[PDB]
Amino acid sequence: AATSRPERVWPDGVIPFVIGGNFTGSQRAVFRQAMRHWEKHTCVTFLERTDEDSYIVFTYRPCGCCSYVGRRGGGPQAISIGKNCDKFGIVVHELGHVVGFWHEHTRPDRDRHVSIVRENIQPGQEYNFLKMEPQEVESLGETYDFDSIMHYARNTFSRGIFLDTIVPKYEVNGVKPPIGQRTRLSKGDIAQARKLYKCPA
Ligand SMILES: [Zn+2]
Ligand SMILES: [Zn+2]
Numbered sequence: 001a002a003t004s005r006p007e008r009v010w011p012d013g014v015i016p017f018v019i020g021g022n023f024t025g026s027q028r029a030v031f032r033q034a035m036r037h038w039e040k041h042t043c044v045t046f047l048e049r050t051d052e053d054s055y056i057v058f059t060y061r062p063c064g065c066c067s068y069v070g071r072r073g074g075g076p077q078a079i080s081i082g083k084n085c086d087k088f089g090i091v092v093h094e095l096g097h098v099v100g101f102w103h104e105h106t107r108p109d110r111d112r113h114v115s116i117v118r119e120n121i122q123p124g125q126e127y128n129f130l131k132m133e134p135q136e137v138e139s140l141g142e143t144y145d146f147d148s149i150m151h152y153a154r155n156t157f158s159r160g161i162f163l164d165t166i167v168p169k170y171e172v173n174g175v176k177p178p179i180g181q182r183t184r185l186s187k188g189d190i191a192q193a194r195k196l197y198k199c200p201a
Contacts (some may be wrong), residue, residue, distance in 0.1 A: 001102035004138035008070025016049035022060035034091035041190045043199035067097040089182030104151040108134040113144040120163040140195040145188030146177035153180025
């Protein structure tokens with residue numbers, strides 16, 4: 001679910017940042033580790049902010065969606081971090097939003113790849129399953145990626161732990177594809193981010 005909107009792509013892949021107050025040294029180190037993870041796999045770079053108008057701010061705040069997707073422009077944009085939601089993989093996911101990715105399940109073509117099990121969605125949480133309009137996403141020729149760091153788990157926003165809200169529609173390399181990993185960028189996330197930022201092949 002890569003943004004189609006050119007203005008949301010950070011110029012030259014450069015993303016200035018500020019780390020806010022109220023974090024421990026270990027939390028701050030995890031933010032830097034997550035930024036380095038994006039840097040080592042793509043041409044995105046993170047720069048300590050000086051006077052740039054647009055930048056990201058790691059902000060002590062309650063956990064919960066949503067980080068702005070791509071570059072907002074005209075000022076800072078916050079990534080909300082708290083005790084519930086500060087691990088490396090969570091931060092890498094939020095930086096996927098900053099880079100310009102919506103949730104994978106919101107791709108306009110998602111219905112070919114996953115079933116959204118409406119019977120199981122927590123009342124009032126249905127909005128989390130809305131597809132992006134087709135004009136808002138351009139997937140750059142990349143296939144739907146079950147392994148994406150941007151993919152929800154099978155029971156995200158479910159009524160029940162064993163009641164799936166998202167079910168992959170087919171197997172990949174002879175297995176039901178697991179969804180919802182928050183350990184590292186997938187091969188597909190990297191390939192697609194490199195296309196989005198026109199990283200030299
Ligand atoms: Zn997200
Ligand atoms: Zn993707």
